[PDB]
A paper describes a structure:
HLA‐E is a nonclassical class Ib HLA expressed by nearly every nucleated cell in the body. The structure of HLA‐E is analogous to classical HLA class Ia molecules: it is composed of an α‐chain with three extracellular domains, comprising the α1‐ and α2‐domains that form the peptide binding groove, an α3 domain that associates with β2m, a transmembrane domain, and a cytoplasmic domain. Expression of HLA‐E on the cell surface is usually reliant on binding of leader peptides from HLA‐A, ‐B, ‐C, or ‐G molecules, typically with the sequence VMAPRTL(L/V/I)L. During normal cellular conditions, HLA‐E presented leader peptides prevent lysis by NK cells via binding to inhibitory NK receptors (NKG2A, etc.). Here, we solved crystal structures of TCRs bound to HLA‐E in complex with well‐characterized peptides from Mtb and HIV, demonstrating divergent binding modes akin to the differences observed for TCRs recognizing distinct pHLA class I complexes.
Author numbering:
A (entry chain D): 1 to 29, 36 to 59, 63 to 68, 74 to 110, 113 to 197, 200 to 206
B (entry chain B): 0 to 99
C (entry chain E): 2 to 29, 37 to 58, 63 to 72, 74 to 81, 83 to 111, 112A, 112B, 113 to 256
D (entry chain C): 1 to 9
E (entry chain A): 2 to 222, 224 to 276
The structure:
């Protein structure tokens, strides 16, 4: 049959860096190779299509090449931006040339560079209740990894970056909270 | 559309010996389209245990089929092939001749 | 134009029959159905090469399709099983082999199949006000929304500032948390952040609301329990800005 | 052995 | 010169569901597989004794390639109806012929592919196996579509590579049958048709391969036009043929029949004898 593999499966890089996503396929007899981007909770949008007869296709900072003989496609991403962060899916024509077969995709995370990190843990109270509280770890480096809770009463979230474009400002943040009656060590 | 009529050959696998088990063949070839009725007849009656080859065609795209059955030629019994095709107004019957 | 898919979310009891809707208005000969699992990405279910023509894909069992028209290519589940819990994508293309190869995908149908619908709950939502410590040290105000105790994972969180949906100064967790991961039926929690300038939060006439659209049971989904029917609904917490 | 592909006319 | 060939036939039957589809494979003049559309679960099945040993993997693959061809041929038949502006009520025929030949060395000599529509040349893969020849201006739209899709590339790869590989494997599997040269058993028969004329019929029986040359000649040179009968199967894998010449009664012994066959070290001369 036709088996499509995408190397790497997961890739995390600082912004501004060049990076490559690969696509290998067992059967070299294909009509068309196609690269798609998948934003979370949404469908696939086609980035590039390379006919068997073509050697590459460019689209801004994205150049895809096609090596039929070696059974390989390389998508070069020049000067990576946070907006590139998505899952990239590769597909080729099936043996009979009647439908597309997809690889399992490459999860890409282009980390925003926090120029002036200011790591701090803040306690937030509910706008309805008083006892109801949340702890917020924020303004920390992109190369900081928030460690797991490993307690079923204490919950800690994975970090995400918010863009305050109004103040041309980025900031990472993870959340911690519990029903027990201390933010202090929670993020460590 | 082009239309070509069947060329019908009715013959035995091996040279006919009376009472000696043989194979009766009806070869239809040189015909188009492929839709064709072929029956082997013993004494005017169609034979039930009749096999046929898989539909194939020659360089000129004309179709050939081999309808055959196991048969024991007797001096009295008359064998034939009956072929219906769009080319033919009425079914064409071809007697088995031992010298053909 | 493009590819349409309904519904966007759907909960089924094991054994229920359901037809996933798909259509395109691009007169495309070629249409296909895929399922996406967190593991092993897109697998072909069924495909079509024209009206009246249908064939099996890589994982065809449990699914039926029909192509009566070029427009429509519905996917039928005859008897729903938990293993058919996935996201389903309908795709069309003018050609598979030629230069006009561009494949267009639908927005996708999220579907979870349960043996019991009794473990289905909507979310409880709480807005947590910025820290004095944050407003002093950074001159910035972070609001944290928290959706909790919802099953299945069928929620869309958004922020509403003075009645308008916002898409800036905001990030929502990519995955929600299982409140008790040891349990397989575990309810979910999801947090989201809204960061504004101290002055914007200090403004007493600024309205902040985080909104969670929950997808649960529909009308004519049997409900017998001593609890309100956990149906598709919006649940929100709010807080005014204050100096 | 059969060809995997048939030409689309 | 050994060959692996396949003959594909698709016949549209409007109102009565999908077209009829039949695929038959040949090594030289010996059929070895077949796929017929008429069944609830139609599969590629063996049609030579030596092909029984091959596994589910082979039959599952050959079944899928065959049913994928039938599906494409259903779209082709819709498309061709459109090209010629024909009624959806009428039945029409698509035929597909492809094969690879080995030279004396036992290496790839040449490949060929042709489509016909309603028993007439439509589209032909050229000698290079990288371009097509449209015989009609209707086949031109198909040529432009195939060039756009680079169809000839995937066919070339099959004809030059896959076809040659498996022709070798088939020629090994039951070479007892395929590589055996069987000479024709030859005799002359005599049939008076009128008072003044008699038919002399030159027989060639139980010969393989199908390729054979039967010609009538007269001692010291008027021979009439030879009636050459279409070469026919005996049903056991060997072939039969006769060549007849109408001749003046009494003069039968002047005429000689000449038989050329690969399985005869030199050509055979026959003469009718009372």
């Amino acid at each position: 049959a036709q088996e499509v593999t995408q190397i790497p499966a997961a890739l995390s890089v600082p912004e501004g860096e060049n990076l490559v996503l690969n696509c290998s396929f067992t059967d070299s007899a294909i009509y068309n190779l196609q690269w798609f981007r998948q934003d979370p909770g949404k469908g696939l949008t086609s980035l590039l299509l390379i006919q068997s007869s073509q050697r590459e296709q460019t689209s801004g900072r994205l150049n895809a090449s096609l090596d039929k003989s070696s059974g390989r496609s390389t998508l070069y991403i020049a000067a990576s931006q946070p907006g590139d962060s998505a899952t990239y899916l590769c597909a080729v024509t099936n043996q009979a040339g009647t439908a597309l077969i997809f690889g399992k995709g490459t999860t890409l995370s282009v980390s925003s560079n926090i120029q002036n990190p200011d790591p701090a843990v803040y306690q937030l109270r509910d706008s309805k209740s008083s006892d109801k509280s949340v702890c917020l770890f924020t303004d920390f480096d992109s190369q900081t990894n928030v460690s797991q809770s490993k307690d079923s009463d204490v919950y800690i979230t994975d970090k995400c970056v918010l863009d305050m474009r109004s103040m041309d400002f980025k900031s990472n943040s993870a959340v911690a909270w519990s029903n027990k009656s201390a933010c202090a060590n929670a993020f460590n | 559309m082009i239309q070509r009529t069947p060329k019908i050959q009715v013959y035995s696998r091996h040279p006919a010996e009376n009472g000696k088990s043989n194979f009766l063949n009806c070869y239809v070839s040189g015909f188009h389209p492929s839709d064709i009725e072929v029956d082997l007849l013993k004494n005017g009656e169609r034979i039930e245990k009749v096999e046929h080859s898989d539909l194939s065609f020659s360089k000129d795209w004309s179709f050939y089929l081999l309808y055959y059955t196991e048969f024991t030629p007797t001096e009295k019994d008359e064998y034939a092939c009956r072929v219906n095709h769009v080319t033919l107004s009425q079914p064409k019957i071809v007697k088995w001749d031992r010298d053909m | 134009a493009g590819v349409t898919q309904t519904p966007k979310f759907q909960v089924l009891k094991t054994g229920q029959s359901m037809t996933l809707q798909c259509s395109q208005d691009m007169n495309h000969e070629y249409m296909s159905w895929y399922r996406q699992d967190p593991g092993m990405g897109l697998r072909l279910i069924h495909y079509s090469v024209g009206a009246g023509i249908t064939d099996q894909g890589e994982v065809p069992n449990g699914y039926n399709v029909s192509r009566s028209t070029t427009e429509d290519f519905p996917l039928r589940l005859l008897s729903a099983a938990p293993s058919q819990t996935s996201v389903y994508f309908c795709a069309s293309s003018y050609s598979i082999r030629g230069s006009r190869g561009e494949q267009f995908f639908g927005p996708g149908t999220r579907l979870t199949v349960l043996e019991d619908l009794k473990n289905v709950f909507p979310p409880e939502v709480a807005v947590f006000e910025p820290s004095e410590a944050e407003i002093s040290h950074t001159q910035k105000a972070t609001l944290v929304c928290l959706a909790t105790g919802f099953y299945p994972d069928h929620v869309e969180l958004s922020w509403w500032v003075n009645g308008k949906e916002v898409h800036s100064g905001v990030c929502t967790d990519p995955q929600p948390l299982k409140e008790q991961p040891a349990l397989n039926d575990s309810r979910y929690a999801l947090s989201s952040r809204l960061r504004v300038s101290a002055t914007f939060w200090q403004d007493p006439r600024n309205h902040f609301r985080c909104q969670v659209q929950f997808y649960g049971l529909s009308e004519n989904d049997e409900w017998t329990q001593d609890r309100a029917k956990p149906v598709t609904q919006i649940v929100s917490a709010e807080a005014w800005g204050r100096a | 052995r059969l060809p995997a592909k048939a030409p689309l006319l | 010169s050994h060959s692996l060939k396949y003959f594909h036939t698709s016949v549209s039957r409007p109102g009565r569901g999908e077209p009829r589809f039949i695929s038959v494979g040949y090594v030289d003049d010996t059929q070895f597989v077949r796929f017929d559309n008429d069944a609830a679960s139609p599969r590629m099945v063996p049609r030579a004794p030596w092909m029984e040993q091959e596994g589910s993997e082979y039959w599952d693959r050959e079944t899928r390639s065959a049913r994928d061809t039938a599906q494409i041929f259903r779209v082709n038949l819709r498309t061709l109806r459109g090209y010629y502006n024909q009624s959806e009520a009428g039945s029409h025929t698509l035929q597909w012929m492809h094969g690879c030949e080995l030279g004396p060395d036992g290496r790839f000599l040449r490949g060929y592919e042709q489509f016909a529509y309603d028993g007439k040349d439509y589209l032909t893969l050229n000698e290079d196996l990288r371009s097509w020849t449209a015989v009609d201006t209707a086949a031109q739209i198909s040529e432009q579509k195939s060039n756009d899709a680079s169809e000839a590339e995937h066919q070339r790869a099959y004809l030059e590579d896959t076809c040659v590989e498996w022709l070798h494997k088939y020629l090994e599997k039951g070479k007892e049958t395929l590589l055996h040269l069987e000479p024709p058993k030859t005799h002359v028969t005599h049939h008076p048709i009128s008072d003044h004329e008699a038919t002399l019929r030159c027989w060639a029986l139980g010969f393989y391969p199908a390729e054979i040359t039967l010609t009538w000649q007269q001692d010291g040179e008027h021979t009439q036009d030879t009636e050459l009968v279409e070469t026919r199967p005996a049903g056991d894998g060997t072939f039969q043929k006769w060549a007849a010449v109408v001749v003046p009664s009494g003069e039968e012994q002047r005429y000689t029949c000449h038989v050329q066959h690969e399985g005869l070290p030199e050509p055979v001369t026959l003469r009718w004898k009372p």
